[PDB]
Amino acid sequence: PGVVLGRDQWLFSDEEFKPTAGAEQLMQENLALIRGVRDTLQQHGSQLVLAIVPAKARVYTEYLGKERPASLHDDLYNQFHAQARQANVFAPDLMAPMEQAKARGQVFLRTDTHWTPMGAEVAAQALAEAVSRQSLLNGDPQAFITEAGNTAPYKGDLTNFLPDPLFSNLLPAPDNLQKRTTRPVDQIPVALVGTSYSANPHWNFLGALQQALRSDVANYAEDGHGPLLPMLKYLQSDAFKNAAPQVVVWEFPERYLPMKNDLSSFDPQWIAQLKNSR
Numbered sequence: 001p002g003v004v005l006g007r008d009q010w011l012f013s014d015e016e017f018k019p020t021a022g023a024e025q026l027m028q029e030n031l032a033l034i035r036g037v038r039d040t041l042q043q044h045g046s047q048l049v050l051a052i053v054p055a056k057a058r059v060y061t062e063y064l065g066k067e068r069p070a071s072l073h074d075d076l077y078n079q080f081h082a083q084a085r086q087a088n089v090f091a092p093d094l095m096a097p098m099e100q101a102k103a104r105g106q107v108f109l110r111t112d113t114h115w116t117p118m119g120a121e122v123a124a125q126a127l128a129e130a131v132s133r134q135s136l137l138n139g140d141p142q143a144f145i146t147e148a149g150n151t152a153p154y155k156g157d158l159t160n161f162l163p164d165p166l167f168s169n170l171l172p173a174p175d176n177l178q179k180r181t182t183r184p185v186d187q188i189p190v191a192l193v194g195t196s197y198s199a200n201p202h203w204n205f206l207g208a209l210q211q212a213l214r215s216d217v218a219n220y221a222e223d224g225h226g227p228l229l230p231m232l233k234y235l236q237s238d239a240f241k242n243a244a245p246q247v248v249v250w251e252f253p254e255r256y257l258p259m260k261n262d263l264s265s266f267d268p269q270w271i272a273q274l275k276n277s278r
Contacts (some may be wrong), residue, residue, distance in 0.1 A: 003161040009172035010063035011111045011158035015255045016055040019070040023258035027083075030228065030257055035087040036274025037231055037250070044244040046191075047136045050091040051127055052080050053115070053197055053253040056108045059098055063110075077254045092130035094123050109175045111156030114197055117180045120205040121146075121212075127249060128212035136247050139189055141214035146207055149179035154202070182207025184216075187243050193231045194221040194251025209249065218245070227252040228261045 002014040020026060038048045054077050057069055077095060084091040098107045098119060107119030115123065131137055154177035162171065182204060190213060192198050198205050198221035210217045220239070222230040231250060234240055263271055 001161065003158045004057075004065070004067050006060075006063040006065045008063055009110065010060065010065075011156065011162070011172060012057050012064075013113050013158065013255070015259070016057040016073060017067060017069040019072055020258045020260075023072050026260055027079075027258045030259075030261065031083050031087060032275040033228060033261075033271075034084070034089060034252075036277040037235065038087065038089050039277035040235055040274065041244075041248055044240070045246075046240075046244045047134075047247050048090060049127060049131060049136070049247055049249050050084055050089050051094060051123065051194070051249055051251045052077065052084070052091050053123070053251060054095040054098060055254050056113060058254075059095070059102070059108060072258060073255075076257065080254050080257050090130075090134070092126055094126055097122050097126045109154070109156055109177075111159050111172050111175050112154070113157055114200065114203055115205075117178055117202070117204050117208075120197070120203040121180075121208040124205060124208035124212045127209065131213060131247060137189060137213065137215060138246070139215070142210075142216055143185045143214060144182050144207070144211040145185060146180055146182040146204070146211050149181065151176050151178045153177070177202060180204045180207070182211055184210075187245075188216050188218040189246045190215050190217040191234070191240075191245045191248045192217050192219045192221055192251070193227075193234050193248060195225075195227050195230070195253060195256075196221075196223040197253060198251045199223045205251070217249075221251065226259065226261060227256050232263075232266060 004012040004014050004017050006012055041048045081091055101107050101122045106116050108115050153174040155174050159171055192206055206219045220234045
């Protein structure tokens with residue numbers, strides 16, 4: 001796990017660049033698992049809304065440096081969407097609105113892998129439009145208010161992969177980060193599953209979803225295990241088994257599709273069920 005230098009003191013995850021051995025079969029395998037998850041949710045009466053997060057390197061190509069991503073990454077976002085469609089998985093396009101939103105300010109942090117709070121809010125709004133368009137939610141709307149607090153420097157997660165403290169003067173300038181918190185005006189109908197994009201309060205993706213959906217949302221995202229393991233954990237949970245939500249939003253950044261997931265802790269019989277759900 002490493003970092004790639006861009007222009008103007010931008011940093012990227014090399015996971016958005018590196019080739020992966022056996023990437024084709026890994027993508028196949030992950031898609032079969034995603035499809036099995038979709039079918040499992042549907043069988044419990046939950047609608048899956050897959051949220052494919054585009055790579056920072058795809059959204060900010062203008063800050064690419066000398067190194068460019070390998071060919072695997074050229075059309076990964078598009079192929080993920082195409083395969084999700086083949087699998088009858090509902091996956092609203094997040095790339096077009098995030099790209100539109102670059103004119104307003106940064107939709108990703110310069111020195112960090114993650115979307116900015118504004119970037120996450122754009123994604124939440126796109127997802128909420130799609131949810132409304134498909135009538136996936138019923139129930140009385142609940143109103144939420146998001147308040148913007150102070151802005152302060154933020155050291156990005158990628159800076160720690162840089163080479164050594166004798167060279168601290170070479171580190172890129174910290175990002176700036178605006179605090180944003182969401183509160184209600186005053187069984188949960190929506191569950192959120194995903195990665196640090198969803199688990200980390202700094203990006204306020206949960207709050208942005210609550211506000212955009214006009215619905216309470218429960219967070220089952222986790223930091224540091226990729227997008228699949230927290231979803232499998234959720235499916236095995238008492239929360240899901242005893243109170244399946246109307247909608248599950250599954251945040252799944254594109255770079256994880258051709259990456260291996262450690263399934264060693266799961267029953268192979270259950271893994272088999274997921275892959276063979278059709």
